[PDB]
Design a protein around this ligand. Structure first.
Ligand code: HEM
Ligand code: HEM
Ligand SMILES: Nc1ccc2ccc(CNCCc3cccc(F)c3)cc2n1
Ligand SMILES: Nc1ccc2ccc(CNCCc3cccc(F)c3)cc2n1
Ligand SMILES: C[C@H](O)[C@H](O)[C@H]1CNc2nc(N)[nH]c(=O)c2N1
Ligand SMILES: C[C@H](O)[C@H](O)[C@H]1CNc2nc(N)[nH]c(=O)c2N1
Ligand SMILES: [Zn+2]
Lengths: 407, 411
């Protein structure tokens, strides 16, 4: 019931109690671990509201005060009367920060209390959503000095009036299947790109076309908008030693802004809650650039480096991988766009875990996601035991809107 | 019930039914995943079902399930249990059990090889000198002058838990570690405690950076005894780099034979507390973990110094750069000296083919992603992208407490 995690590099042992608060389920049982699987009414709502308000009033050292009891009463009356309820601004801010705090898959959570929350609950139309989103983009981008932010659209009601951003990130590149056989642009986004085209976007059909936003207000049919190009900060990718690197024609965008997740606070569901922080270098250089199913550029880079691609045991992939990642970091830094390397980010996270154990009694963490996709055991998180469990408020996955939406 | 796993690179979906045969527990619950936790005297009562289930599996594998030989064997084991309180495995069943413990080892990336395992039956062994002789023969056989062959040597099973056979060493071949008065370590920091035990037992330590430890061998619950493996049996590879000529001057070498000796083999409820086994190295075990872990030889700084990388900011990726060079060096050295080694690309690719084969023919392959994914270049290996289900099948290899924590000293 009280659980120990050990760091095997430093022998530091932490004791977890926070897991006993855990409410939602993991996918695992006593008979089978699913640790590596990517995706494992009135009656229901009041317990969820109560649990949330309890922790909120606890956090401001007013647990069991008249202000606490009154609010519980007030929300209870509102649920009974209206079958839903509204969060005070203070509760919404607390809820959003805590959803990030509780994100077991996020290595950047040392930052969790510095999150700018944009309340867009008064939004009613897709043009309105576009306006809020451009404002988020500009605020978060901050000319390269990136700031963490979330923009929160109205909560689900009867679920036939959902707000959704159809995009997976606010800023992403299109992907096109070619008449010849290959893929141009980002292969991850072929189906979304097609939806845009079918809805009427005219694609310039290049390798790096910033997708248009596809915005759905109030359960309505989604609409297209182009983010003003001037709000999209992009970085040309060069290498501090290899002059030929620039000729590869690689660029990436500065702002990682995830827009397809669902924020759950006190039982309320925010189906449109685009949020943004800043990149860890490996996301672009290892995953975006080198996944065989992504831009998949390892082959081309190795050639330019004139490496022995005959045998896997020359480690040519590994050599080229490192160079690509040096170049990503160098390019962002040269252009003064916030980026974090995997050594710095994981070291920060170890510190954050220690803070959380010390101040909160634990920190849910998913080792499979937290350890970087390159150089795992030379980062301290590799050697850190982690306990994974589900706390609310939370960010959750939801099915892509096009499989759900009734036109 | 059917469970699906997806590969997110290929979209290949596999269906697992084998998990239904799993009895032992994982550590996980519906409320907590313990997937990254490193480590998460039987009565007659508990013994007969364990024996029965095992013999049922054995007889099925030989297509003799429910045969007269199957039934007579169950009856003979049952009578032997309630009379003698334990039972002896036939040679065929021992071989089958040792292979399956390997097949079932969810943290093992090299399991494509599981059916090629040389089993040495050392159950007639009685003394530590006897153990030493078995172990030397194992080493010489497995080494095969660089053309490594997988093998296991199986000493007598646990009886009352007071007469255990144990190899105190964690691997048959491993380098000594010496904690210095100034707090620095000479040799391998992983083996300081064990090195101290050996010294106390009377080993004369050469005190260098790569001293092969003596064997500390326990037979029949007696105090363990020290023995030196003949040096001519210990194959070693000096480490050099194909392009960097100063690399040799780092003074590095490693041994060819990885031979884990501190695990417990469980077959049909029987416990084999001394069952040293050996395969061959995946290059990252030495080049990533043994050489570059901060708590091990920790050579990253000196290597990057010599490469003259920019070391003032971690964002130069000097560590990642030095890591790749060291790992190229390890593979190059082993290949050049004709000692078996596998790189992490080849090994993970083979594992994926093994796993798909196992799903088709066996209905599953239990696998621990946390261990299967290599400790460098994780996502450019196919296993990173592969969903895996971790569950526990028997026969199995299990951890056991270090023997110095539990041994009752005779004196
Ligand atoms: C401030 C800089 C931040 C850094 C460096 C960072 C780092 C990361 C990284 C590297 C991932 C893994 C994503 C992947 O591999 O696809 C991740 C996951 C995640 N982070 Fe962050 N994070 C940051 C800010 C944020 C913010 C502001 C939020 C929300 C308010 C957040 C919530 C999440 C969530 C929910 C996941 C899991 C996503 C999923 O399951 O697909 N993070 N974080
Ligand atoms: C034949 C070549 C083999 C290769 C390349 C190989 C590869 C590996 C590697 C790289 C590990 C992880 C080691 C670590 O990080 O500590 C491992 C784990 C393991 N392998 Fe193998 N393996 C081989 C043969 C064997 C053999 C012969 C056995 C036993 C008969 C075996 C049973 C295991 C077990 C039980 C583990 C888990 C160890 C633990 O939990 O500490 N493997 N394998
Ligand atoms: N730098 C950051 C910060 C927060 C992030 C939050 C989310 C993400 C992207 N996560 C998507 C992972 C994913 C990919 C493909 C399928 C899937 F189910 C899930 C990236 C982030 N990067
Ligand atoms: N090449 C091989 C083959 C089989 C192996 C079997 C076991 C191992 C070593 N595993 C050590 C695991 C370990 C290290 C430190 C603490 C701990 F609890 C467990 C290495 C192997 N290498
Ligand atoms: C199958 C496996 O769970 C999958 O490839 C995971 C592994 N770890 C990951 N870790 C992070 N941060 N991001 C990912 O997309 C993944 N993918
Ligand atoms: C805490 C964590 O579980 C631990 O460091 C593990 C991670 N994965 C590993 N994987 C392998 N193959 N070997 C190891 O020693 C480890 N160590
Ligand atoms: Zn689990």
């Amino acid at each position: 019931r009280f659980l120990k995690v050990k760091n095997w590099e430093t022998d530091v042992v932490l004791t977890d109690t926070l897991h006993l608060k855990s409410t939602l389920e993991t996918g695992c049982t006593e008979h089978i671990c699913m640790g590596s699987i990517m995706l494992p009414t009135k009656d229901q709502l009041f317990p969820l509201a109560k649990e949330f308000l309890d922790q909120y009033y606890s956090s401001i050292k007013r647990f069991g005060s008249k202000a606490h009891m009154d609010r519980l009463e007030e929300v209870n009356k509102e649920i009974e009367s209206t079958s839903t309820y509204q969060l005070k601004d203070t509760e919404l801010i607390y809820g959003a920060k805590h959803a990030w705090r509780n994100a077991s898959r996020c290595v950047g959570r040392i930052q969790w209390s510095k999150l700018q929350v944009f309340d867009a609950r008064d939004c009613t139309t897709a043009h309105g959503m576009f306006n809020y989103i451009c404002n988020h983009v500009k605020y978060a981008t901050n000319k390269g000095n990136l700031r963490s932010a979330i923009t929160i659209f109205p909560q689900r009601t009867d679920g036939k009036h959902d707000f959704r951003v159809w995009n997976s990130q606010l800023i992403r590149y299109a992907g096109y299947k070619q008449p010849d056989g290959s893929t141009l642009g980002d292969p991850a986004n072929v189906q979304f790109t097609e939806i845009c085209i079918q809805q009427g976007w005219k694609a310039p059909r290049g390798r790096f076309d910033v997708l248009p936003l596809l915005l759905q207000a109030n359960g309505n049919d989604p609409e297209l908008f182009q983010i003003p190009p001037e709000l999209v900060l992009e970085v040309p990718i060069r290498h501090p030693k290899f002059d030929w690197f620039k000729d590869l024609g690689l660029k990436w965008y500065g702002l990682p802004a995830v827009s397809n997740m669902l924020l759950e606070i006190g039982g309320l569901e925010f189906s449109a809650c685009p949020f943004s922080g800043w990149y860890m270098g490996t996301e672009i250089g290892v995953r975006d650039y080198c996944d065989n199913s992504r831009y998949n550029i390892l082959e081309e880079v190795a050639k330019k480096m004139d490496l022995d691609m005959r045998k896997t045991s020359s480690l040519w992939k590994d050599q080229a991988l490192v160079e690509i990642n040096i170049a990503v970091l160098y390019s962002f830094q040269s252009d003064k766009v916030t980026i974090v390397d995997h050594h710095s980010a994981t070291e920060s996270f170890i510190k954050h875990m220690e803070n959380e154990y010390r101040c909160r009694g634990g920190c849910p963490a998913d080792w499979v996601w937290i350890v970087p996709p390159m150089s795992g055991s030379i980062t301290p998180v590799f050697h850190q035991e982690m306990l994974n469990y589900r706390l609310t408020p939370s960010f959750e996955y939801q099915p892509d809107p096009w499989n759900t939406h009734v036109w």
